[PDB]
Design an enzyme around this catalytic site. Structure first.
Site, mmCIF file in Angstrom:
data_model
loop_
_atom_site.group_PDB
_atom_site.id
_atom_site.type_symbol
_atom_site.label_atom_id
_atom_site.label_comp_id
_atom_site.label_asym_id
_atom_site.label_seq_id
_atom_site.Cartn_x
_atom_site.Cartn_y
_atom_site.Cartn_z
ATOM 1 N N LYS A 7 0.831 -1.205 0.000
ATOM 2 C CA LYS A 7 0.000 0.000 0.000
ATOM 3 C C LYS A 7 0.878 1.273 0.000
ATOM 4 O O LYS A 7 0.626 2.243 -0.743
ATOM 5 C CB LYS A 7 -0.930 -0.048 1.217
ATOM 6 C CG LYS A 7 -1.808 1.169 1.378
ATOM 7 C CD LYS A 7 -2.978 0.943 2.319
ATOM 8 C CE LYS A 7 -3.707 2.269 2.524
ATOM 9 N NZ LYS A 7 -5.057 2.178 3.166
ATOM 10 N N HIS A 12 2.857 5.887 -2.641
ATOM 11 C CA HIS A 12 3.920 6.891 -2.518
ATOM 12 C C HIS A 12 5.156 6.669 -3.321
ATOM 13 O O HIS A 12 6.032 7.536 -3.326
ATOM 14 C CB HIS A 12 4.325 7.032 -1.044
ATOM 15 C CG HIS A 12 3.161 7.266 -0.139
ATOM 16 N ND1 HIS A 12 2.424 8.428 -0.172
ATOM 17 C CD2 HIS A 12 2.580 6.473 0.796
ATOM 18 C CE1 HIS A 12 1.456 8.351 0.723
ATOM 19 N NE2 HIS A 12 1.528 7.175 1.323
ATOM 20 N N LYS A 32 -8.973 11.314 -2.713
ATOM 21 C CA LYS A 32 -8.077 11.445 -1.563
ATOM 22 C C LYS A 32 -7.545 12.865 -1.584
ATOM 23 O O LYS A 32 -6.910 13.239 -2.564
ATOM 24 C CB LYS A 32 -6.909 10.464 -1.641
ATOM 25 C CG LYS A 32 -5.931 10.614 -0.485
ATOM 26 C CD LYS A 32 -4.935 9.467 -0.422
ATOM 27 C CE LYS A 32 -4.266 9.409 0.942
ATOM 28 N NZ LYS A 32 -2.892 8.853 0.845
ATOM 29 N N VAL A 34 -5.056 14.789 -0.134
ATOM 30 C CA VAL A 34 -3.632 15.020 -0.412
ATOM 31 C C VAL A 34 -2.812 13.724 -0.405
ATOM 32 O O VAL A 34 -3.111 12.769 0.332
ATOM 33 C CB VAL A 34 -2.968 16.011 0.558
ATOM 34 C CG1 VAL A 34 -3.721 17.339 0.628
ATOM 35 C CG2 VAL A 34 -2.804 15.377 1.934
ATOM 36 N N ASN A 35 -1.781 13.709 -1.243
ATOM 37 C CA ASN A 35 -0.910 12.544 -1.357
ATOM 38 C C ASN A 35 0.418 12.937 -1.958
ATOM 39 O O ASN A 35 0.457 13.732 -2.895
ATOM 40 C CB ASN A 35 -1.558 11.485 -2.247
ATOM 41 C CG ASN A 35 -0.800 10.158 -2.251
ATOM 42 O OD1 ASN A 35 -0.743 9.465 -1.240
ATOM 43 N ND2 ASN A 35 -0.233 9.794 -3.400
ATOM 44 N N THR A 36 1.495 12.343 -1.447
ATOM 45 C CA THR A 36 2.823 12.619 -1.957
ATOM 46 C C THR A 36 3.412 11.410 -2.653
ATOM 47 O O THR A 36 3.318 10.282 -2.159
ATOM 48 C CB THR A 36 3.756 13.040 -0.815
ATOM 49 O OG1 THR A 36 3.262 14.250 -0.266
ATOM 50 C CG2 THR A 36 5.176 13.265 -1.302
ATOM 51 N N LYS A 57 3.631 12.174 13.675
ATOM 52 C CA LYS A 57 2.580 13.144 13.957
ATOM 53 C C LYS A 57 1.594 12.629 14.975
ATOM 54 O O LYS A 57 1.116 13.382 15.781
ATOM 55 C CB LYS A 57 1.846 13.556 12.673
ATOM 56 C CG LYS A 57 2.380 14.843 12.079
ATOM 57 C CD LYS A 57 1.894 15.020 10.644
ATOM 58 C CE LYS A 57 2.532 16.208 9.972
ATOM 59 N NZ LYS A 57 2.356 16.219 8.488
ATOM 60 N N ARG A 76 -2.514 17.746 -4.220
ATOM 61 C CA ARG A 76 -3.457 18.407 -3.338
ATOM 62 C C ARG A 76 -4.664 18.755 -4.186
ATOM 63 O O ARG A 76 -4.526 19.420 -5.214
ATOM 64 C CB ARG A 76 -2.842 19.717 -2.816
ATOM 65 C CG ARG A 76 -1.649 19.570 -1.863
ATOM 66 C CD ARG A 76 -0.674 20.739 -1.998
ATOM 67 N NE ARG A 76 0.149 20.978 -0.816
ATOM 68 C CZ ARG A 76 0.885 22.074 -0.628
ATOM 69 N NH1 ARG A 76 0.909 23.045 -1.543
ATOM 70 N NH2 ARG A 76 1.606 22.195 0.488
ATOM 71 N N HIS A 110 4.028 4.066 5.926
ATOM 72 C CA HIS A 110 3.258 5.292 6.105
ATOM 73 C C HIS A 110 4.102 6.489 5.745
ATOM 74 O O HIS A 110 5.259 6.583 6.157
ATOM 75 C CB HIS A 110 2.813 5.400 7.580
ATOM 76 C CG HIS A 110 2.255 6.733 7.942
ATOM 77 N ND1 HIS A 110 1.133 7.207 7.320
ATOM 78 C CD2 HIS A 110 2.647 7.706 8.804
ATOM 79 C CE1 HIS A 110 0.814 8.396 7.811
ATOM 80 N NE2 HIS A 110 1.725 8.727 8.710
ATOM 81 N N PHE A 111 3.523 7.406 4.980
ATOM 82 C CA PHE A 111 4.151 8.680 4.705
ATOM 83 C C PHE A 111 3.621 9.704 5.659
ATOM 84 O O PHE A 111 2.436 9.969 5.640
ATOM 85 C CB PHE A 111 3.851 9.137 3.307
ATOM 86 C CG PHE A 111 4.674 10.314 2.893
ATOM 87 C CD1 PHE A 111 5.930 10.141 2.305
ATOM 88 C CD2 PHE A 111 4.218 11.590 3.135
ATOM 89 C CE1 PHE A 111 6.691 11.244 1.939
ATOM 90 C CE2 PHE A 111 4.970 12.688 2.780
ATOM 91 C CZ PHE A 111 6.206 12.519 2.186
ATOM 92 N N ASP A 112 4.485 10.257 6.510
ATOM 93 C CA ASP A 112 4.028 11.110 7.618
ATOM 94 C C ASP A 112 4.063 12.591 7.246
ATOM 95 O O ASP A 112 3.140 13.337 7.571
ATOM 96 C CB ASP A 112 4.895 10.884 8.863
ATOM 97 C CG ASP A 112 4.140 11.143 10.182
ATOM 98 O OD1 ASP A 112 3.024 10.601 10.406
ATOM 99 O OD2 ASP A 112 4.703 11.863 11.035
#
Length: 115
Positions: A7, A12, A32, A34-36, A57, A76, A110-112
């Site tokens: 995932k 990402h 979604k 926002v996503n990087t 976070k 975004r 996870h992208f924080d």
């Protein structure tokens, strides 16, 4: 089941935004917000799990910040966005990433944030 690592990779990794967000299935049930995406090798990103340990976070302690800046893209959503026409502003930057790592092998799940 996908797996959190898979995932993470789906969401990402990409060694623009509307298309990639569509391709990776981030416009499916909803848009979604926002996503990087990270434009580095998978190995470079995975190595982040052994770099600068920092608080997540949410307060867990298993986050890691890349010693080097990395090429990323922030997606975004726009105001003009409505599913299934999910619309995204693309923003390129070179920033340090922060990811949460877990498991054995110890990899990003996870992208924080980016800094």
């Amino acid at each position: 089941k996908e797996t959190a690592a898979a995932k993470f990779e789906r969401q990402h990794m990409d060694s623009y935004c509307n298309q990639m967000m569509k391709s990776r299935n981030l416009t499916k049930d909803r848009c979604k917000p926002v996503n990087t995406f990270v434009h580095e090798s998978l190995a470079d990103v995975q190595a982040v799990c052994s770099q600068k340990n920092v608080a997540c976070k949410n307060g867990q302690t298993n986050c890691y910040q890349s010693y080097s800046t990395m090429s990323i893209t922030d997606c975004r959503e726009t105001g003009s966005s409505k599913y299934p026409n999910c619309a995204y502003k693309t923003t390129q930057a070179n920033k340090h990433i922060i990811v949460a790592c877990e498991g054995n092998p110890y990899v990003p799940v996870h992208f924080d944030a980016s800094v």
